Amino acid sequence: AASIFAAVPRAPPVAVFKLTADFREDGDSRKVNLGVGAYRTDEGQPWVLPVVRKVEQLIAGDGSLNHEYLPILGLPEFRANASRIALGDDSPAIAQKRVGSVQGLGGTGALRIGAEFLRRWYNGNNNTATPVYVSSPTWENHNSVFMDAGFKDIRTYRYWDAAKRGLDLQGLLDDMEKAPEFSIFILHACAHNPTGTDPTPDEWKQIAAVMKRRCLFPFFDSAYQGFASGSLDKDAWAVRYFVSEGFELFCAQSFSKNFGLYNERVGNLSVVGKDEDNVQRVLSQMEKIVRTTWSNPPSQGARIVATTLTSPQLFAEWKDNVKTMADRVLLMRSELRSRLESLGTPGTWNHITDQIGMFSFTGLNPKQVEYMIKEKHIYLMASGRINMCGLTTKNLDYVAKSIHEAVTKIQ
Amino acid sequence: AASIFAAVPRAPPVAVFKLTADFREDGDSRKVNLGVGAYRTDEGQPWVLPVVRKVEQLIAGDGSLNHEYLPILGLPEFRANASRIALGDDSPAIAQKRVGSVQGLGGTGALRIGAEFLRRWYNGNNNTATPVYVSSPTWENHNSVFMDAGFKDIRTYRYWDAAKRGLDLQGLLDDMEKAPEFSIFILHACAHNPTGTDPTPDEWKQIAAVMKRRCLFPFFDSAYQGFASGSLDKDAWAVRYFVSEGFELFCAQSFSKNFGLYNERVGNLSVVGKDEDNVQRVLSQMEKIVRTTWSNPPSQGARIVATTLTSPQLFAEWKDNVKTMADRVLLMRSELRSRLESLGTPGTWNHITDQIGMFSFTGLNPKQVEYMIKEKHIYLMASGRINMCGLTTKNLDYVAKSIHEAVTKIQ
Ligand SMILES: *Cc1c(COP(=O)(O)O)cnc(C)c1O
Ligand SMILES: *Cc1c(COP(=O)(O)O)cnc(C)c1O
């Protein structure tokens, strides 16, 4: 008769990916992709890390590997090593056998499993009322992941100060001071998406004081370790500080960007609990959650990461590759800002060099963004967020001039 | 003090996987792993298919490949081809452009995405009361996946007849007759897990007639296409019959077993709708579901499959590899019937031979199973379910004997 799907509404496509598709089909020779948060070389091309290519060849020559199911929680070598990189080899948590790790389908999969676990066993039993706090603004998928896992009350914490083009520390702390005890806070470890604005170590200490006092739960999202500053240790400062202060916490780690393994979906969920027994019990429940979601994780991506992290020579080469990407972005920040300034572009552009990681929050309004896209063929998010990795020595002038036109002629 | 996880109970581990862990840990030299549904050669080792081996080399040498994110719904070439394999090249549904595909994390991931979709948009909006029927017995994860998706009413339809050692057609039909309109039925496409007993085509026509009249929803679970008989076309008959009968349905395909790609998590969810518009709207919603689960799927496994399916030469080789596996199972069944029979062991064993796929529902009760596990050192499911691929020309009698004992001694 009528289709059983007759009343199913058409949902719009996920914005960031649609932006990419639009860009790919555009035939204008001046096109620039500043949308999705992916790394690009100075030639504007994707970059498979040299260390990755190397491990890929190793893997392919190893006739000893098979394709049998991995354990539900994931590849052991991968899990242990991933958590070690996030927390540091000398972590008190590792020494005390207080850390558990669950392999996830990229950083998103790790966040999802963590959300699912909390909804069922944290702050009660099947308590969907625990508030979940996200930054204002934050990566779109945070809200969605938490709502799909079952949470009903998602709130925001002050973060970006548009007027000042910086961190609204006072409002952030105020929102935390008034958050009900046990509330869940989604925190970006470093390289905030989409602002690029991070708290300084001194500000992080203020944040942790409130959270400890009010028993707020720190759920870190770490998708850019290394990418931010070129240093794995500096980039993990916040996470390690919380661990050292004695918090129990979760850390969703992605290897999509730091390893350039986007399409292999490699992530890890680190669980830091009070003791060994508690983490083991958490893990046992997470195994049940994974079982009904993806059953067990894929191996290719995890094996590349595990091989790299366990070999001293490969590990050193990976660190170099990561620093190459971070340095490139630094260069682009400096270069764009300079151009904008010399062009006499209205406003202040120091946020361009103050910001960290892949993104910069430009301040462009929606009509100004439309202009960039429709007229200049420069693809960026509606929020005015730009991916600095899309910038090259060859397209810098064009982009800086386009921004100048947008601020001046669209106003 | 007092961890936030203090009261989180220790969950029992996933049975099948636990069984493999124990096995590996066991020291007895008579060790037989008759648990997990994974193929093994006559030498009792995992088998990476030759075609997979070839494609893996092909991939590794292709320098044009990159690791940029795949579209949310999956690798286009994989999507198209996978559905083609399930429905047939000449499928009118494919010709009418009324088939949609979503790449999933193994067959489990495909089932999960389908379940999440149904719960939100089928038979009303967010109608968690729609009954979901699973066979008696079935693959344990069926219940778990649907419950996790939000469904509260999971029922069973009669299936196995312990007395006749076959399909209880009358009970099954009766269960369908009494099922409320619009109920969801989880159907095994072929090689029923765990009984190995499938309806014949005429029995399938009878099942379909009742489903059609009562508007029952067919949710096919296709994890063994090519294993029930060694022929991909034979094994897909029932799904294709339903399509030809005009049904709207879902088919969750797994490539874990037929490609031996267990650890690369390659699956596909095929959606068959009344027309293109309907399938397009369904897919738009599936995109949002995938976004919050794994974001986008991994590439390795899907690339292997797509490459295989798109090359006539590789495709023919794959078909040969699949037949090798099927034939080897037929041999073991043939044989078993022999040792048991010829060796004066009581009962009717034409079920071992009438049973199709990896599993045989033996008959061993819990204690015989325990007998078999603790003294003998033959690991198998608690149900009496044996994995034929565990048998070999050199472990044979030691296993038949064992069963002879359990049916003699310990019963
Ligand atoms: C990229 C990103 C993720 C998701 O990473 P995947 O590995 O692609 O799932 C999560 N959080 C933030 C802040 C990200 O930038
Ligand atoms: C193996 C299997 C699945 C799921 O397979 P994966 O690809 O491992 O997720 C689903 N259903 C049945 C009946 C199976 O045997």
B291 and chain A in contact, CB less than 8 A? yes
Q: Per the CB < 8 Å rule, is A298 touching B300?
A: yes
Inter-residue contact A166 to A200 (CB < 8 Å): no
Kind and range of the H or E element at A154?
A: strand A154-158
B366-373 LR contacts (CB < 8 Å, sep 24+): B367/B410, B367/B411, B368/B406, B368/B407, B368/B410, B368/B411, B369/B406, B371/B405, B371/B406, B371/B409, B371/B410, B372/B402, B372/B403, B372/B406
Kind and range of the H or E element at B53?
A: helix B50-61
Query: What would the DSSP string read from start to end of B104-168?
Result: EEHHHHHHHHHHHHHHHHSSSSS-TTS-EEEEES--THHHHHHHHTT---EEEEE-EETTTTEE-
Chain B residue numbers touching A141 (CB-CB < 8 A) = 291-292, 295
Question: Tokens at residue B304, please?
Answer: 């292997």
> With b meaning 16 or more CB within 10 Å and e meaning fewer, what string describes B112-148?
bbbbbbbbbbbbeeeeeebbbbbbbbbbbbbbbbbeb
If you measure CA to CA, which chain B residue comes closest to A148? Answer: B292
Cα–Cα nearest to B185, from B225, B125, B242, B228:
B242
Kind and range of the H or E element at A291?
A: helix A276-291
Phi, psi of A153 (to 5 degrees): -115, 90
> With b meaning 16 or more CB within 10 Å and e meaning fewer, what string describes B247-273?
bbbbbbbbbbbbbbbbbbbbbbbbbbb
Q: Per the CB < 8 Å rule, is A121 touching B287?
A: no
Q: Per the CB < 8 Å rule, is A5 touching B296?
A: no
Q: How many Å lie between the centroid of ligand 2 and the Cα of residue A161?
A: 50
Respond yes or no: is residue B121 known to be catalytic: no
Chain A residue numbers touching B295 (CB-CB < 8 A) = 105-106, 108-109, 141, 265
Catalytic residue among B47, B139, B160, B349: B139
Phi, psi of B268 (to 5 degrees): -150, 135
- Ligand 2 atom 12 nearest Cα: B223
DSSP 8-state secondary structure symbol assigned to residue A124:
S
- Ligand 1 atom 1 nearest Cα: A223
CA distance linking residue A27 with residue B116, whole number of Å:
38
Annotated binding site of A: 37, 139, 193, 385
B69 and chain A in contact, CB less than 8 A? yes
List residues of A with catalytic annotation: 139, 221, 257
Domain ranges of chain B: 14-47+327-407, 48-326
CA distance linking residue A295 with residue B146, whole number of Å:
14
Phi, psi of A104 (to 5 degrees): -125, 160
Kindly list the distances between the CA atom of residue A11 and the CA atoms of A303, B1, B108, B287, in Å, as whole numbers in the listed order: 36, 47, 24, 9
Kindly list the distances between the CA atom of residue B328 and the CA atoms of A410, B46, B96, B333, B357, in Å, as whole numbers in the listed order: 72, 14, 39, 9, 11
Inter-residue contact B86 to B239 (CB < 8 Å): yes
Inter-residue contact A14 to B288 (CB < 8 Å): yes
Residue A394, Ramachandran bin (φ over 0: left; ψ between -120 and 50: alpha; else beta): alpha
Distinct helix (H) and strand (E) counts, chain B = 16, 13
User: Rounded to 5 degrees, what angle do the CA atoms A88, A94, A100 make?
Assistant: 105
Respond yes or no: is residue B160 known to be catalytic: no
Experimental method: X-ray
Cα–Cα nearest to A305, from A348, A343, A256:
A256
Q: How many Å lie between the centroid of ligand 2 and the Cα of residue A45?
A: 38
If you measure CA to CA, which chain B residue comes closest to A217? Answer: B4
Residue A237, Ramachandran bin (φ over 0: left; ψ between -120 and 50: alpha; else beta): alpha
Strands A184-188 and A217-222: parallel
User: Rounded to 5 degrees, what angle do the CA atoms A261, A264, A267 make?
Assistant: 80
3-class DSSP assignment, residue A359:
strand
Q: Which residues pair with A361 in a beta bridge?
A: A385
CA distance linking residue B127 with residue B327, whole number of Å:
45
Number of neighbouring beta carbons within 10 Å of residue B46? 14
| Nearest neighbour of B287 by CB, restricted to A14, A67, A148 | A14
Answer whether CATH 3.40.640.10 is correct for domain B48-326. Answer: yes
CA distance linking residue B400 with residue B411, whole number of Å:
16
Provide CB contacts within 8 A for B302, sequence distance 6+. B70, B74, B75, B78, B103, B266
The pocket around ligand 1, CB under 6 angstroms, is made up of A 37, 106-108, 139, 188, 193, 221, 223, 254, 256, 267; B 295
Q: How many Å lie between the centroid of ligand 2 and the Cα of residue B406?
A: 30
CA distance linking residue B6 with residue A278, whole number of Å:
6
> With b meaning 16 or more CB within 10 Å and e meaning fewer, what string describes A89-99?
eebebbeeebb
Min distance A385 CA to chain B CA atoms (Å) = 19
Rg (C-alpha) for chain B, rounded Å, is: 22
CA distance linking residue B178 with residue B131, whole number of Å:
12
Torsion over CA: B271, B276, B277, B281 (sign): positive
Nearest ligand to the CA of B106 is 2
3-class DSSP assignment, residue A75:
coil
Amino acid at A234: K
Q: Per the CB < 8 Å rule, is B8 touching A217?
A: no
Strands (E), A166-313: 166-167, 184-188, 217-222, 249-254, 266-272
Nearest ligand to the CA of A112 is 1
Kindly list the distances between the CA atom of residue A44 and the CA atoms of A146, A282, A335, in Å, as whole numbers in the listed order: 35, 44, 16
CA distance linking residue A66 with residue B385, whole number of Å:
25
Which of A17, A108, A141, A225 is the best mutation target for the ligand 1 pocket, counting ligand atoms within 8 Å of the beta carbon and taking the most? A108
A209 and chain B in contact, CB less than 8 A? no
Inter-residue contact A135 to A197 (CB < 8 Å): no
Torsion over CA: B38, B42, B46, B48 (sign): negative
Question: Tokens at residue B242, please?
Answer: 């339903």
3-class DSSP assignment, residue A24:
helix
Provide CB contacts within 8 A for A55, sequence distance 6+. A304, A307, A308, A314
If you measure CA to CA, which chain B residue comes closest to A118? Answer: B5
CA distance linking residue A231 with residue A44, whole number of Å:
24
Provide CB contacts within 8 A for A221, sequence distance 6+. A107, A111, A139, A142, A186, A187, A188, A189, A252
Determine which of B52, B69, B284, B287 to mutate to test the interface with A (most A C-beta atoms within 10 Å). Answer: B69
A96 and chain B in contact, CB less than 8 A? no
Chain B residue numbers touching A145 (CB-CB < 8 A) = 292
User: Rounded to 5 degrees, what angle do the CA atoms A353, A357, A363 make?
Assistant: 55
Q: Per the CB < 8 Å rule, is A108 touching B292?
A: yes
For chain A, what's the residue count?
411
| Nearest neighbour of A141 by CB, restricted to B281, B291, B298 | B291
Q: Per the CB < 8 Å rule, is A280 touching B5?
A: no
Q: How many Å lie between the centroid of ligand 1 and the Cα of residue B287?
A: 17
Q: Which residues pair with B271 in a beta bridge?
A: B100, B250
Considering only residues 185 to 204 of chain A, which have any Cβ-Cβ distance to chain B shorter than 8 Å? none
Q: Per the CB < 8 Å rule, is A287 touching B36?
A: no
Inter-residue contact B375 to B344 (CB < 8 Å): no
Ligand 1 atom closest to the Cα of residue A191 is 13
Q: Which CATH class, in words, describes the domain spanning B14-47+327-407?
A: alpha beta
Inter-residue contact A326 to A235 (CB < 8 Å): no
Strands A132-136 and A184-188: parallel
Annotated binding site of B: 37, 139, 193, 385
3-class DSSP assignment, residue A144:
helix
Q: How many Å lie between the centroid of ligand 2 and the Cα of residue A361?
A: 45
Q: How many Å lie between the centroid of ligand 2 and the Cα of residue A354?
A: 50
CA distance linking residue B247 with residue B213, whole number of Å:
11
Annotated binding site of B for L-aspartate: 37, 139, 193, 385
> With b meaning 16 or more CB within 10 Å and e meaning fewer, what string describes B333-358?
bebbbebbeeeebeeebebbeebbbb
Query: Residue B180, preceding bond cis, omega within 30 degrees?
Result: no
A137 and chain B in contact, CB less than 8 A? no
Q: Per the CB < 8 Å rule, is B263 touching A299?
A: yes
If you measure CA to CA, which chain B residue comes closest to A264? Answer: B298
Query: Residue B297, preceding bond cis, omega within 30 degrees?
Result: no
Question: Tokens at residue A381, please?
Answer: 């998010």
Strands (E), A320-393: 359-361, 378-379, 385-387
Chain B residue numbers touching A130 (CB-CB < 8 A) = none
